UniProtKB/Swiss-Prot annotation, chain A:
It comes from the Eukaryota. Component of the PAF1 complex, which consists of CDC73, PAF1, LEO1, CTR9, RTF1 and SKIC8. The PAF1 complex interacts with PHF5A. Within the PAF1 complex interacts directly with PHF5A. Component of the SKI complex which consists of SKIC2, SKIC3 and SKIC8. WD repeats lie at residues 10-53, 58-97, 100-139, 142-183, 184-223, 226-265, 268-300. Keywords: Acetylation, Cytoplasm, Nucleus, Repeat, Transcription, Transcription regulation, WD repeat, Wnt signaling pathway. The gene is SKIC8. PROSITE patterns: WD_REPEATS_1, WD_REPEATS_2, WD_REPEATS_REGION. This is Superkiller complex protein 8. Component of the PAF1 complex (PAF1C) which has multiple functions during transcription by RNA polymerase II and is implicated in regulation of development and maintenance of embryonic stem cell pluripotency. PAF1C associates with RNA polymerase II through interaction with POLR2A CTD non-phosphorylated and 'Ser-2'- and 'Ser-5'-phosphorylated forms and is involved in transcriptional elongation, acting both independently and synergistically with TCEA1 and in cooperation with the DSIF complex and HTATSF1. PAF1C is required for transcription of Hox and Wnt target genes. InterPro entries: G-protein_beta_WD-40_rep (IPR020472), SKI8 (IPR051510), WD40/YVTN_repeat-like_dom_sf (IPR015943), WD40_repeat_CS (IPR019775), WD40_repeat_dom_sf (IPR036322), WD40_rpt (IPR001680). CDD domains: WD40.
UniProtKB/Swiss-Prot annotation, chain B:
Found in adrenal and parathyroid glands, kidney and heart. It is linked to Hyperparathyroidism 1: An autosomal dominant disorder characterized by hypercalcemia, elevated parathyroid hormone (PTH) levels, and uniglandular or multiglandular parathyroid hyperplasia, adenomas, and carcinomas. The lineage of its organism: Eukaryota, Metazoa, Chordata, Craniata, Vertebrata. Residues 1-33 are annotated as: Interaction with CTNNB1. The gene is CDC73. This is Parafibromin. Component of the PAF1 complex, which consists of CDC73, PAF1, LEO1, CTR9, RTF1 and SKIC8. The PAF1 complex interacts with PHF5A. Within the PAF1 complex interacts directly with PHF5A. Interacts with POLR2A, CPSF1, CPSF4, CSTF2, KMT2A/MLL1 and CTNNB1. Interacts with a Set1-like complex that has histone methyltransferase activity and methylates histone H3. Found in a complex with BCL9L or BCL9, CDC73, CTNNB1 and PYGO1 indicative for the participation in a nuclear Wnt signaling complex. Interacts with PTPN11. Interacts with SETD5. Phosphorylated. Dephosphorylated by PTPN11. It comes from Homo sapiens. Tumor suppressor probably involved in transcriptional and post-transcriptional control pathways. May be involved in cell cycle progression through the regulation of cyclin D1/PRAD1 expression. Component of the PAF1 complex (PAF1C) which has multiple functions during transcription by RNA polymerase II and is implicated in regulation of development and maintenance of embryonic stem cell pluripotency. Belongs to the CDC73 family. It is found in: Nucleus.
UniProtKB/Swiss-Prot annotation, chain C:
It is found in: Nucleus speckle. It comes from Homo sapiens (Human). This is RNA polymerase-associated protein CTR9 homolog. The lineage of its organism: Eukaryota, Metazoa, Chordata, Craniata, Vertebrata. Component of the PAF1 complex (PAF1C) which has multiple functions during transcription by RNA polymerase II and is implicated in regulation of development and maintenance of embryonic stem cell pluripotency. PAF1C associates with RNA polymerase II through interaction with POLR2A CTD non-phosphorylated and 'Ser-2'- and 'Ser-5'-phosphorylated forms and is involved in transcriptional elongation, acting both independently and synergistically with TCEA1 and in cooperation with the DSIF complex and HTATSF1. PAF1C is required for transcription of Hox and Wnt target genes. Widely expressed. Disulfide bonds: none annotated. TPR repeats lie at residues 19-51, 58-91, 104-137, 138-171, 173-205, 220-253, 254-287, 288-321, 324-357. Component of the PAF1 complex, which consists of CDC73, PAF1, LEO1, CTR9, RTF1 and SKIC8. The PAF1 complex interacts with PHF5A. Interacts with KMT2A/MLL1. Interacts with STAT3. Interacts with SETD5. Interacts with ERCC6. (Microbial infection) The PAF1 complex interacts with Zika virus French Polynesia 10087PF/2013 non-structural protein 5/NS5. The interaction with viral NS5 proteins may reduce the antiviral immune response by inhibiting the recruitment of the PAF1 complex to interferon-stimulated genes, thus preventing their transcription.
Amino acid sequence: YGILFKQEQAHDDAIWSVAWGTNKKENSETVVTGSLDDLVKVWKWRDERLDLQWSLEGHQLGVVSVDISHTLPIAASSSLDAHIRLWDLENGKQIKSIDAGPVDAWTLAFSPDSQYLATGTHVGKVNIFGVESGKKEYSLDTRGKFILSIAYSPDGKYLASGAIDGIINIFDIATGKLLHTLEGHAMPIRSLTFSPDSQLLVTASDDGYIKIYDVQHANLAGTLSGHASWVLNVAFCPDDTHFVSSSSDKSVKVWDVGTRTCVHTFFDHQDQVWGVKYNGNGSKIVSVGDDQEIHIYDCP
Amino acid sequence: VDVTRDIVSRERVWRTRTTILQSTGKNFSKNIFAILQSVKARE
Amino acid sequence: RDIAKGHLKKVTEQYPDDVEAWIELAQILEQTDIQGALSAYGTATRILQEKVQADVPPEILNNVGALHFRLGNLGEAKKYFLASLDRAKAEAEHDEHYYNAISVTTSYNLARLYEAMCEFHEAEKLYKNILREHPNYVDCYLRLGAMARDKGNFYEASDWFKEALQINQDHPDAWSLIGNLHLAKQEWGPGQKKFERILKQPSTQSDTYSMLALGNVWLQTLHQPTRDREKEKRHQDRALAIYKQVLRNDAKNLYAANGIGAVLAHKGYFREARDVFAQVREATADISDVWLNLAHIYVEQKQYISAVQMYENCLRKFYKHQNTEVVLYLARALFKCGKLQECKQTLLKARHVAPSDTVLMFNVALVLQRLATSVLKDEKSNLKEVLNAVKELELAHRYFSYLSKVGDKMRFDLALAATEARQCSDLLSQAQYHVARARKQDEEERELRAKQEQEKELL
Amino acid sequence: AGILFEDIFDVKDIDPEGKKFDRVSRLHCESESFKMDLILDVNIQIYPVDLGDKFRLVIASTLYEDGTLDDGEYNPTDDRPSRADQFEYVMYGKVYRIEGDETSTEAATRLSAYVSYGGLLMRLQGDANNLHGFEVDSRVYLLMKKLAF
């Protein structure tokens, strides 16, 4: 439990998200990050060292979300420019640019099958674009204020959504219908992710509480006291034994998904951490933030 | 019950709402009300 | 207290087998410097073991842990509180000193610490353990509402605070918390005067807290275009009278001068607002309000060099990173290169946390237009920038098209976007004109490099 | 105005290398807002100072409020307003070296004003933003006042 690699000045501007692979499809070894300097750096974590592989540009505004396809070695990047651009980590070239106009573009959500791409809409709906089509296939008709977070389950059975007022919207990607509407929060939900078994659902609201709900029966599994600031990013260990939590207080707490206890905490970041993600095995925990330093956290 | 008078009689409250309002130093109104009246005289 | 301090200074030097002298030393220094009391308890803890093997009473460890609670020694204070609880539990025969009250207060401080130790679960459990044994206690029942209030101001907080007032209406803290409830939604602007005037009876008087609440709620009514109707001038006069009244009875209250400076700034005296805010700053500048009221004066006098840092410092607190109001106050009259392109970076940082605001989406377009007109009118500059400016202008035009469809606005309709559209149209024309200039500069540089290469071939 | 610099400081170490003289000592002070170093040398005899004391140092190009740019000469018989009326320790010197972390390409980010009050030295090291009013070969004052806090 410590830090292995320490990438100083990973970017010109603050990093808001980090993507790292978990499968063996040339993704776990390459780290894709998106910052406000319009630099989609494709870092290759080779030789247990963070080396730059590609430097993709083209986004007018800073990168808001980065994620790696589960069953595919390509990637994509969205911004607030309403131009969601697909990329390829095999050549460092651009596949396409989904003009999600006029402003309707938010964080990405790669489907586990790597065939659909969910994107938040200012009208409150969740537009589901096609990866190889780019056109709006079907939109979830659950209006409200706005979609602040979208996550796909690893096995593709459910899909949740974080609103601006703590409204979890449990959709069904198998049929495209709203099943449950968990409203256990009144704070803007920052980010969320599905458990490796698609059984627990962590919510990173702006109250400092990690309220882990259930998806099968839409009930709260327990209120966990997080940090003092707002939990920004949250990820599960691939082996499903713990989960890290990124907050806005220079604190990287690794809370236990089973006992609801912090097993270790990092304070190496001088600024707030914006993105946290695991490795393919759960030992290395990559992290980014306003410090513009990528820290690789090893927890053997 | 006696538990109320049992605690409020031994404790000590060094700071309360009003304490936060006054500065811990000595800043009287002689240097404040002077300008407060000067601004009014010009009008 | 001065005579007691002198007497303690006399008893400190000599050593007539002093045992409780340091206890009296620390009992006065709790209001003063918190390290003096800690030193006194530190030495007093060891002076109780030479006469006999007697365990330290829990009241001293409890008070020293309380001293450390305000400090950064949260874990050390936690150990002090746990050991105090252990010791107070051992007092099976101290029913006259009421070991039970000692355990109650120790646990109260311990729950306050856990609430401050990023652990609200344990704080809730401990405060409830106090409730189950003594429901006539107020502070625990009030902190529980604070805890539920973090998640939202309509949860059990709003209910517990009123139940605490209903059990004790003569509790100034509970009633002020009641008034604090109405502050989340300012729709109760004029009507909150009644609920803030409940305990303004002479028995409670004088109460500076409620009077300054009235002054604030009366200042909130300002910033309206109805001043020429002799309505806001009367409001300024009323609030000024309130501040004068709370000044005469208390000259050291900083908030009264704070509000006086606020109104005087509202009266148009910014040259004279710095002097009034100077005393408030010099007394204690670590209050969120002053950094902004002063930064307003600095940003008013064409000094963004002295205003951006004040806005950054208020954000140095561990409560947020990108606030909307601070950045809104950040960009006021920025026209310089480091105050436009970077202004876009801070605007995007702000909109990232909550893009639903219209003012951000309008200001980003305005600064984009400013840069485009600043590179496509008198320039004659680099070529790649002319390539990027058209993209920026297109994005600005798309935001112009999008902003027009929104119903609600910033208490002011945005129907004046038409001039922005005309500006962007003539900017498009100028850009299509200046791209040719870009190509001309391209051929110029090409012929320059050729006529240099020929000379290098000569050599 | 003429306020070339204005900031609060606090004393943190005196004569670390051992007090050399008997009436002057080094004050390795630090700021509170701009985060700038300070190596002021005050007359400890007439104006004693201990650790932890805070003071409001204000480098001013002139002692008049209107800023008439006095020639520079001792003329006590003067009824004009003076900024020294609210300071317990004022000095007069002439900055002689402005060192900075400049490079061959990009401008400096941190300067260091070296001013000599007739023998008493002072280095106001910090960022290169608030030191715009300092130019080599120019008269300046000190205008420091201890804060009671």
